[PDB]
Amino acid sequence: MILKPENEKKLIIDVLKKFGVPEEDAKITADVFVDADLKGFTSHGIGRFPQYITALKLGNINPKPDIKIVKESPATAVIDGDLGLGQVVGKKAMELAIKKAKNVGVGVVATRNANHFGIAGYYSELAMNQDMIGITITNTEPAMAPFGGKEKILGTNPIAIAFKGNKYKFSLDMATASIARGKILEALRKKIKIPEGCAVDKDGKPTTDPAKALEGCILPFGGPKGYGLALAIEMLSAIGGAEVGTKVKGTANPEERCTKGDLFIAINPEFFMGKEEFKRKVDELLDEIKNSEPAEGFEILIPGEIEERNKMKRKDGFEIDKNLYNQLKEICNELGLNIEDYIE
Amino acid sequence: MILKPENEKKLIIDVLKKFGVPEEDAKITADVFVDADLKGFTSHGIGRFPQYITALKLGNINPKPDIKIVKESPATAVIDGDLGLGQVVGKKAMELAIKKAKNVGVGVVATRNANHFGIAGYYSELAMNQDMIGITITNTEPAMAPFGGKEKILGTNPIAIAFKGNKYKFSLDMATASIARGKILEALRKKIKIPEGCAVDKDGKPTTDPAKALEGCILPFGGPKGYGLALAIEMLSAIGGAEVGTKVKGTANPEERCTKGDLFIAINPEFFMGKEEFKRKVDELLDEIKNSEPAEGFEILIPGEIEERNKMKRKDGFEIDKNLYNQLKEICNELGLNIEDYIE
Numbered sequence A, B: 001m002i003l004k005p006e007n008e009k010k011l012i013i014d015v016l017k018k019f020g021v022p023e024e025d026a027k028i029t030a031d032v033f034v035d036a037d038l039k040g041f042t043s044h045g046i047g048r049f050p051q052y053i054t055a056l057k058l059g060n061i062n063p064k065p066d067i068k069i070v071k072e073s074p075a076t077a078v079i080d081g082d083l084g085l086g087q088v089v090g091k092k093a094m095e096l097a098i099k100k101a102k103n104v105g106v107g108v109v110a111t112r113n114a115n116h117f118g119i120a121g122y123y124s125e126l127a128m129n130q131d132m133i134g135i136t137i138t139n140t141e142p143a144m145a146p147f148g149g150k151e152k153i154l155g156t157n158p159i160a161i162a163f164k165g166n167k168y169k170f171s172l173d174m175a176t177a178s179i180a181r182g183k184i185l186e187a188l189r190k191k192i193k194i195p196e197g198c199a200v201d202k203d204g205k206p207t208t209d210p211a212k213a214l215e216g217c218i219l220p221f222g223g224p225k226g227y228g229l230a231l232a233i234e235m236l237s238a239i240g241g242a243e244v245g246t247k248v249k250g251t252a253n254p255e256e257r258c259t260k261g262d263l264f265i266a267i268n269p270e271f272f273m274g275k276e277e278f279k280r281k282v283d284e285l286l287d288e289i290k291n292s293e294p295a296e297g298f299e300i301l302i303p304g305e306i307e308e309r310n311k312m313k314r315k316d317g318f319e320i321d322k323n324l325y326n327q328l329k330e331i332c333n334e335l336g337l338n339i340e341d342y343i344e
């Protein structure tokens, strides 16, 4: 059934307020949920909300955190999240990264002790919309093997990079994993194969069967190269004192304290070639790319284009499945709220 | 014959000094060349030296650059190379990025109007060997299509990421191109297919045939994802005012004035979780990986391990072909040096 985004925002706010989350913290959280559902990253949108409820009750999410800047300098900071909503910590960190970059040209803000923050692209787009370059990375509970290995050690480790000109936007937002676990589960319901070169089974051997893949490992994307970048990311994400490797828990499991890290970077074009000079060049490059000769059955896209298109289509509502609408009804009921104020 | 590391250094120094390069700048340049050759990155080793001679002679390399820091903050800087040797400008650029990271936790330095700087890893490791995290990116002449296209726009756009713990080091140094043209025509003369997804037709169709490859267009490394990264590199590399896209000239062709860009980033763990604790975590991560279970006919390796084993195996000198010997013989002859002083 169709769920209007504004109504998704009000649903999340009213529910989070019910657990003590201050209104401004709640509004912030919702925005990042709505962004994901609008872009089609549906697995980091509302459908993930019940998991948040589970964690709030088990007290793995602190509704009223003491967010602290434990280390600071003109160009860097470390932030302790106090087990608060990743969105709230995340926005603070990146907002502070942006502030520092405006003063001295670049800002690097690492976080520890926060929860999963949703889609990385939201944060680096905060930078883009200040006329800057935003870069965001984080790690994850183990999901992927080293290249040539069969054990789950690395996270799905996303990186997001955003910036824009006068006409074009650039918004790379990607997991270093070659496939989401959700898309494997999904493929297991719909009794089909997963793409080739996306997972290996219990044995280190390649596999297209979803059931095997689920007890095996997902592969980093671009062979040894993509593995290398996921390793780099596992590490850089954690420089504020988070865990790495197998000690990273609690990113998708509400029964565990969250131990992952996030890095937020903001580079400020005014300190280099100049803001207006940069925007002209981004435009010129992306325009060149966009107008180059297509291969056979393709239309050349800029990173981010697909997500923007999704948002347009989805601005007036998007579908959600019954089983989730049910989980919502229930949560709403517990907190003395009417599911019908939001989904109608 | 066999070329020994020491004699390659001498050879390069003597030749460059001959052109008015100051000895200290020659020594730095020789060092990157020898690094390229010992690691096995032969396309950036002494193999490339004859073109530097052509460039110097045509005036596209300035043996005596007035290298200027044109903009500076406490975390950022733009350096203009006055068409100097890329190695000379690069070292100064990365060392400045490092100095600033020493004071404020991070240093980002962009370059413009400098030449090809050899392997990106060298500059990243300077940071690593100061107990920091080094990141280098850079531009090149159009070498590959955007994803879904069939026309050269993106350079091979390398990235180098380096850092270390106490026992383990991490040194990723990699082109965003699926494959090097070099290896394709070595697959042609070798008659073997090249891997899949690497390149497209003279028509825009996928092809594992080196002959069609050679007529077509190479692709970035990781599907859309690899493509997105390389597009980001193409742009970020050039925020110091460099060119982008097809405006990037002279990184392979000694008849063109070079217009590429470099970005140097240095991140200091002292301003985050702390130096010693970061080295412990690096080791904790890299040990876990290096000792997780391998796949069947595989060994698990950390980015940098291959080059390290290479540098070990080629300390006593390495092989060069008759062709390069001859180029090098003439170069020496016209300068009154004697090739026999170096390849005895």
Ligand SMILES: NC(=O)c1ccc[n+]([C@@H]2O[C@H](COP(=O)([O-])OP(=O)(O)OC[C@H]3O[C@@H](n4cnc5c(N)ncnc54)[C@H](O)[C@@H]3O)[C@@H](O)[C@H]2O)c1
Residues within 6 Å of the ligand: A041, A044, A116, A117, A118, A119, A120, A121, A138, A139, A140, A156, A157, A158, A160, A171, A172, A173, A174, A175, A176, A180, A251, A300, A301, A302, A303, A304, A305, A306, A307, B147, B148, B224, B225, B228
């Ligand atoms: N917080 C976490 O724990 C966590 C972990 C992993 C991933 N994630 C998120 O999941 C989301 C989805 O990731 P994904 O890897 O499945 O994304 P994709 O669905 O793999 O999208 C990745 C990027 O590639 C680009 N792209 C795809 N096809 C393209 C084409 N034909 N031409 C040009 N560009 C193209 C897209 O625009 C997009 O920016 C991400 O936004 C990420 O932030 C979050």
Ligand SMILES: NC(=O)c1ccc[n+]([C@@H]2O[C@H](COP(=O)([O-])OP(=O)(O)OC[C@H]3O[C@@H](n4cnc5c(N)ncnc54)[C@H](O)[C@@H]3O)[C@@H](O)[C@H]2O)c1
Residues within 6 Å of the ligand: A147, A148, A224, A225, A228, B041, B044, B116, B117, B118, B119, B120, B121, B138, B139, B140, B156, B157, B158, B159, B160, B171, B172, B173, B174, B175, B176, B180, B251, B300, B301, B302, B303, B304, B305, B306, B307
């Ligand atoms: N300055 C310039 O203009 C310029 C431009 C492009 C490239 N380059 C350089 O060319 C060189 C070639 O790079 P490349 O991409 O062809 O090298 P690869 O041989 O393609 O190297 C990529 C990385 O993958 C790693 N690797 C390979 N196999 C692995 C495995 N089994 N497990 C773990 N890691 C593994 C390697 O250690 C290496 O660091 C690079 O050093 C790059 O810096 C320079």
